[PDB]
Design a protein around this motif. Structure first.
Motif, mmCIF file in Angstrom:
data_model
loop_
_atom_site.group_PDB
_atom_site.id
_atom_site.type_symbol
_atom_site.label_atom_id
_atom_site.label_comp_id
_atom_site.label_asym_id
_atom_site.label_seq_id
_atom_site.Cartn_x
_atom_site.Cartn_y
_atom_site.Cartn_z
ATOM 1 N N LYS A 2 50.636 -68.549 5.721
ATOM 2 C CA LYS A 2 50.038 -69.682 5.047
ATOM 3 C C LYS A 2 48.834 -69.252 4.242
ATOM 4 O O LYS A 2 48.123 -68.326 4.638
ATOM 5 N N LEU A 3 48.643 -69.886 3.085
ATOM 6 C CA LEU A 3 47.458 -69.639 2.275
ATOM 7 C C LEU A 3 46.277 -70.371 2.882
ATOM 8 O O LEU A 3 45.951 -71.485 2.468
ATOM 9 N N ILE A 4 45.666 -69.745 3.883
ATOM 10 C CA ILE A 4 44.494 -70.298 4.556
ATOM 11 C C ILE A 4 43.599 -69.135 4.934
ATOM 12 O O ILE A 4 44.001 -67.982 4.814
ATOM 13 N N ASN A 5 42.383 -69.435 5.364
ATOM 14 C CA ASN A 5 41.525 -68.416 5.951
ATOM 15 C C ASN A 5 41.502 -68.625 7.462
ATOM 16 O O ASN A 5 42.565 -68.607 8.076
ATOM 17 N N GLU A 13 37.882 -76.296 3.581
ATOM 18 C CA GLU A 13 38.094 -75.560 2.340
ATOM 19 C C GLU A 13 38.906 -76.357 1.308
ATOM 20 O O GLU A 13 38.577 -76.348 0.131
ATOM 21 N N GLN A 14 39.938 -77.061 1.763
ATOM 22 C CA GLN A 14 40.783 -77.866 0.884
ATOM 23 C C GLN A 14 40.098 -79.122 0.348
ATOM 24 O O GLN A 14 40.281 -79.480 -0.826
ATOM 25 N N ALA A 16 36.800 -79.326 0.059
ATOM 26 C CA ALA A 16 35.796 -78.779 -0.859
ATOM 27 C C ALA A 16 36.397 -78.590 -2.262
ATOM 28 O O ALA A 16 35.767 -78.969 -3.261
ATOM 29 N N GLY A 17 37.623 -78.040 -2.321
ATOM 30 C CA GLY A 17 38.381 -77.884 -3.575
ATOM 31 C C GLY A 17 38.658 -79.212 -4.267
ATOM 32 O O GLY A 17 38.491 -79.340 -5.489
ATOM 33 N N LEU A 18 39.065 -80.205 -3.480
ATOM 34 C CA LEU A 18 39.298 -81.558 -3.980
ATOM 35 C C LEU A 18 38.079 -82.168 -4.689
ATOM 36 O O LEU A 18 38.207 -82.720 -5.796
ATOM 37 N N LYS A 20 35.304 -80.571 -5.829
ATOM 38 C CA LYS A 20 34.974 -79.741 -6.990
ATOM 39 C C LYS A 20 35.903 -79.981 -8.189
ATOM 40 O O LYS A 20 35.477 -79.850 -9.336
ATOM 41 N N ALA A 21 37.157 -80.343 -7.904
ATOM 42 C CA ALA A 21 38.175 -80.520 -8.925
ATOM 43 C C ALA A 21 38.127 -81.902 -9.563
ATOM 44 O O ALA A 21 38.586 -82.078 -10.686
ATOM 45 N N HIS A 22 37.596 -82.877 -8.833
ATOM 46 C CA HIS A 22 37.702 -84.270 -9.238
ATOM 47 C C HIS A 22 36.342 -84.988 -9.239
ATOM 48 O O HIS A 22 35.940 -85.579 -8.225
ATOM 49 N N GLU A 56 49.433 -84.638 1.260
ATOM 50 C CA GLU A 56 48.876 -84.575 -0.099
ATOM 51 C C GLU A 56 50.002 -84.665 -1.142
ATOM 52 O O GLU A 56 51.029 -84.007 -1.006
ATOM 53 N N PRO A 57 49.821 -85.494 -2.180
ATOM 54 C CA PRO A 57 48.595 -86.230 -2.517
ATOM 55 C C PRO A 57 48.287 -87.498 -1.715
ATOM 56 O O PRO A 57 47.248 -88.111 -1.950
ATOM 57 N N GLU B 291 47.116 -76.450 -0.109
ATOM 58 C CA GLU B 291 46.781 -75.029 -0.220
ATOM 59 C C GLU B 291 46.272 -74.673 -1.616
ATOM 60 O O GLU B 291 45.398 -73.819 -1.748
ATOM 61 N N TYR B 293 44.460 -76.607 -3.506
ATOM 62 C CA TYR B 293 43.046 -76.989 -3.454
ATOM 63 C C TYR B 293 42.160 -75.966 -2.752
ATOM 64 O O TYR B 293 41.022 -75.774 -3.152
ATOM 65 N N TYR B 296 41.684 -73.321 -5.386
ATOM 66 C CA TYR B 296 40.712 -73.786 -6.389
ATOM 67 C C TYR B 296 39.295 -73.651 -5.862
ATOM 68 O O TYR B 296 38.406 -73.278 -6.601
ATOM 69 N N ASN B 297 39.105 -73.941 -4.578
ATOM 70 C CA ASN B 297 37.819 -73.797 -3.923
ATOM 71 C C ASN B 297 37.252 -72.382 -4.027
ATOM 72 O O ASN B 297 36.077 -72.205 -4.367
ATOM 73 N N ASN B 313 40.333 -78.579 -15.401
ATOM 74 C CA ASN B 313 41.272 -77.950 -14.513
ATOM 75 C C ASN B 313 42.606 -78.700 -14.438
ATOM 76 O O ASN B 313 42.698 -79.908 -14.703
#
Lengths: 354, 354
Positions: A2-5, A13-14, A16-18, A20-22, A56-57, B291, B293, B296-297, B313
């Protein structure tokens, strides 16, 4: 894979991306919830929903003008707790009340019901809409009713346009409940999702098996049956929508005038010849968009043969289950007034038109 | 395990679905191509592209006001033949010429070049933009240059807005070529796609491997390396965009005044501190939106450290590779004029804003 840390951090993290993106969204913290940047909007009914992450969404992608005022994400496939819901609703109350859209699951119902009582006691005018569109129910002992799935999106949009037009709290709840009684869904899976804290998929399937009557939480379906072809798959789904369309059940709604839950018996009629519908071909997560067009192609043929007129459609990933390979079909019976609410402006991350 | 019927019919059925779903499109037959329902639009430059099927929504999802006039789908991962391209261009010519956008692959180049000469000979004013944004190239003997990937989408939108506001064929071409020199892409895969005529995926990966520098035709990438985390993955991608940003190569463009190909050595400069960019985090097919998002983070952090400003973006499934589990990142350098073309109206199945 999975694309995670770190597993503890996946949602931080996800989200935070949301944020920053919107720029149109505000991520609130302690507790964490999302609202439109300009919430509360004075003089309009506020619309709130929420549920587990992993869809999501749904729901954060639907926050904006003409749809949700805010949404409460929970842990992966886990309802948000009453504290998020309470604070989110307080944040978005525009003086006209708050409508809570609740998908029919035990956790969701409990948590949203608890917040509703908490809100009413703090003087917030609130009522509720329960979504129970998934027509697949395993023949066993239980209880939970029908699940809330992709028709949640269609109702969120239609009730959001009514709120935005300036309909009252009661008129908005009444439309949501009426639309719930007219929308029908079924989902299938060719492959399971993997939750980050798993290391193996929800269930396994042979190369010629499909999981029929599947939800949004990675659960196996109502049964395992042969996978033969797209047309056969779509045909069993469409037939099921018809034969399981009729449904009688007890639902609770918050009566804010009396400060109590009002139970009601409600009936769904099946789709019939002559009905006009909105069709949602919904990606459950990992199906190619091209294949969904193949599904739409067959769906229109079966609709035409049954005397159904598809007036509008949505094709894409609107209510998902992480990386599950599968899809759902939702048909919602509409009329002229409902179509006008569909065509009204919506300005959200996932749906935008003007 | 694919949602198809007979293998001979996959594209026939998906394109049928496309046409029934989207009244703003016209599906033409014999040969098959797709146009805006109101094409040809008189008095404006027409924009045309095309490529293999399997990249949905690219290109047919980008047909509409402010983007493509039409698109020529070929077979799965195969370029369309010159006849589709010729007929499609003839259908959309509005008297102001046709601009062909071509992704840099051996097949696409040969086919679109053949159609260009044919169109010229029929008195259609035409020129070409080549897209070669993918910075990942295997260190070996071969000779095809850099591949055209997700930056094709951003370029189609920006050049689409310029055609729509009424810029000449020459101005639109120069804008497309300039933008090509300022955009940089890279993709990775954690899982391969399966083509319908295969019954096995295009490559296999250990549970801790990723395919680095992957395209859109299900090809293995430029190498296999360990997969450790989202952050490490994004960091290697981001680092690669920088170190491989500098690029000198020979491109051909159709000179319609002389009736011949004009070769030109063109240079890409790497992204640099102070640059303003549009960022696209693109699903290659089966990655959960959540993922993306998370990607993007991390991307925002690295951009900020590098001195890059992300002005706009896009996050989602815009240029895919069937059911491939992976993603790409595209960064395109922009200024005020370019941002105003981005913000301009676009009305397509995949991109819609007002």
């Amino acid at each position: 894979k999975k694309l995670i840390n770190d597993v503890q951090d996946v949602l931080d993290e996800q989200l935070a991306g949301l944020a920053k993106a919107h720029p149109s969204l505000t991520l609130h913290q302690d507790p964490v919830y999302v609202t439109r940047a300009d919430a509360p909007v004075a003089g309009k009914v506020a619309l709130l929903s929420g549920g587990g992450s992993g869809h999501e969404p749904m729901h954060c992608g639907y926050i904006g003008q003409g749809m949700l005022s805010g949404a409460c994400p929970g842990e992966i496939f886990t309802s948000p707790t009453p504290d998020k819901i309470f604070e989110c609703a307080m944040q978005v109350d525009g003086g006209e009340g708050v409508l809570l859209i609740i998908k029919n699951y035990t956790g969701d119902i409990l948590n949203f019901e608890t917040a509703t009582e908490l809100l009413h006691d703090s003087g917030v005018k609130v009522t509720t809409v329960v979504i129970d569109d998934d027509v697949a129910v395993k023949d066993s002992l239980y209880t939970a009713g029908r699940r809330g799935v992709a028709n949640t999106v269609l109702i969120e949009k239609l009730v959001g346009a009514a709120a935005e037009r300036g309909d009252s709290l009661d008129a908005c709840a009444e439309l949501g409940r009426k639309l719930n009684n007219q929308g029908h869904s079924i989902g299938i899976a060719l492959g399971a999702c993997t939750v980050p804290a798993a290391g193996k998929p929800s269930f396994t399937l042979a190369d010629n098996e499909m999981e029929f009557g599947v939800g949004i939480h990675g659960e196996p379906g109502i049964d395992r049956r042969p996978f033969s072809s797209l047309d056969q798959t779509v045909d069993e789904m469409f037939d099921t929508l018809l034969v399981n369309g009729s449904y009688h059940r007890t639902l609770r709604f918050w009566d804010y005038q009396q400060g109590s839950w009002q139970e009601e018996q409600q009936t769904k009629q099946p789709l019939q010849s002559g009905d006009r519908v909105i069709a949602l071909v919904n990606n459950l997560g990992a199906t190619p968009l091209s294949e969904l067009y193949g599904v739409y192609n067959r769906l229109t043929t079966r609709c035409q043969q049954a005397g159904l007129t598809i007036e509008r459609n949505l094709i894409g990933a609107y209510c998902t289950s992480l990386d599950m390979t599968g899809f759902s079909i939702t048909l919602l019976k509409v009329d002229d007034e409902t179509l006008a609410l569909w065509d009204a402006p919506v300005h959200t991350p996932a749906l935008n038109w003007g």
